[PDB]
Design an enzyme around this catalytic site. Structure first.
Site, PDB file in Angstrom:
ATOM      1  N   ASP A   1       0.820  -1.203   0.000  1.00 28.97           N
ATOM      2  CA  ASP A   1       0.000   0.000   0.000  1.00 28.97           C
ATOM      3  C   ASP A   1       0.858   1.259   0.000  1.00 28.97           C
ATOM      4  O   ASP A   1       1.339   1.684   1.053  1.00 28.97           O
ATOM      5  CB  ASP A   1      -0.902  -0.021   1.235  1.00 28.97           C
ATOM      6  CG  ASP A   1      -1.812   1.178   1.330  1.00 28.97           C
ATOM      7  OD1 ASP A   1      -1.947   1.901   0.325  1.00 28.97           O
ATOM      8  OD2 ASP A   1      -2.426   1.367   2.414  1.00 28.97           O
TER       9      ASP A   1
ATOM     10  N   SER B   1      -0.809  15.468 -12.165  1.00 27.43           N
ATOM     11  CA  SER B   1      -1.067  15.086 -13.542  1.00 27.43           C
ATOM     12  C   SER B   1      -1.322  16.334 -14.379  1.00 27.43           C
ATOM     13  O   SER B   1      -1.876  17.320 -13.892  1.00 27.43           O
ATOM     14  CB  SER B   1      -2.269  14.140 -13.605  1.00 27.43           C
ATOM     15  OG  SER B   1      -2.661  13.873 -14.941  1.00 27.43           O
TER      16      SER B   1
END
EC number: 3.4.23.22
Length: 330
Positions: free
Chosen positions: A35, A199
């Site tokens: 994770d 992004s």
């Protein structure tokens, strides 16, 4: 040193991925959920409340000759999906894919929430976010990666998750045969303890690319792709009959649909998520309404590039002094 381990979907939908981890001496192998959005290595154990164990493999520290109780240390964590666990702490030897750390903090669960109990395939979590998020008190502990880092050939790990197929976590090296083209690196902020990046935009299907900054985290422990409501609405508007259902808890779509791809930007590069990666199947057995793999982050408080996004790429978690993230197509 290096390590390399195969990671395997837990079910036919890629709801999560499990990776075998050796703990203790002799080794006890547990299948952990790696994770990159958390920083605790915790396991089902011989200390876990019996009624809260249902099929998991447990760590028994009393059977490990290298286990040592970390005196006075406790831990307690709550995750973004409302699940939680807590317990006490041992140090022990932990190996992943041939890479060994001695003195790793292994957090032994005394209590786990129902979602953990109900998932028989996941024996615990191995956190790979920054150690500043580790919950051990009163002395915070380091992640497996942080402990291994100085010994690694290069201070990196890579995630190569499969679509409906096994994939690979590598530590200490970049497998140049595992991706196509080049890896595009992008800046990371560690201010929130995550692999947080921006992004450069998105496209839906064959549509034009929208240049827009989307801050979010690369999180292997989250199944889906969570993005701003504007982006998510633009995606699902291209699927006839798709709608956001408050009763179901997100966007659903007719199972008869063909889903469009979704593209996200990494600098000037583009990662394409095929439409099929966005199908999470019937909302309930036998239903013709299917759950979508792109969902709104509104009210999460952060955008999350979870497995839906990451499995479309070869992803480098670069833990150099100034960390960065790299993405390549594959």
């Amino acid at each position: 040193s290096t390590g390399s381990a195969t990671t395997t979907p837990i079910d036919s939908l890629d709801d999560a991925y499990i990776t075998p981890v050796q703990i203790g001496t002799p080794a006890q192998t547990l299948n952990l959920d790696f994770d990159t959005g958390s920083s605790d290595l915790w396991v089902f154990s011989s200390e876990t409340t019996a009624s809260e164990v249902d099929g998991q493999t447990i760590y028994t520290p009393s059977k490990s000759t290298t286990a040592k109780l970390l005196s006075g240390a406790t831990w307690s964590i709550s995750y973004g999906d409302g699940s939680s666990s807590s317990g006490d702490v041992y140090t022990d030897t932990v190996s992943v894919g041939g890479l060994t750390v001695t003195g790793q903090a292994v957090e032994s669960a005394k209590k786990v929430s129902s979602s953990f109990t109900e998932d028989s395939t996941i024996d615990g979590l191995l956190g790979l976010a920054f150690s500043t998020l580790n919950t051990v008190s009163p002395t915070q502990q380091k992640t497996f990666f942080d402990n291994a880092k100085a010994s690694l050939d290069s201070p990196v790990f890579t995630a190569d998750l499969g679509y409906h197929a096994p994939g690979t976590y590598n530590f200490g090296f970049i497998d140049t045969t595992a991706y196509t083209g080049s890896i595009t690196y992008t800046a990371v902020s560690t201010k929130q303890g995550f692999w947080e990046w921006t992004s450069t935009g998105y496209a839906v299907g064959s549509g034009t690319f929208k240049s827009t900054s989307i801050d979010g985290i690369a999180d292997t422990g989250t199944t889906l792709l969570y993005l701003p409501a504007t982006v998510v609405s633009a995606y699902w508007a291209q699927v006839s009959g798709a709608k956001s259902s408050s009763s179901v808890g997100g966007y659903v779509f007719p199972c008869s649909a063909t889903l469009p791809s979704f593209t996200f930007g990494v600098g000037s590069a583009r990662i394409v998520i095929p439409g099929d990666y966005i199908d999470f199947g019937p909302i309930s057995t036998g239903s013709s309404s299917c759950f979508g793999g792109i969902q709104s982050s509104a009210g999460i408080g952060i955008n999350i590039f979870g497995d839906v996004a990451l499995k479309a790429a070869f992803v480098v978690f670069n833990g150099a002094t100034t960390p960065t993230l790299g993405f390549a197509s594959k």
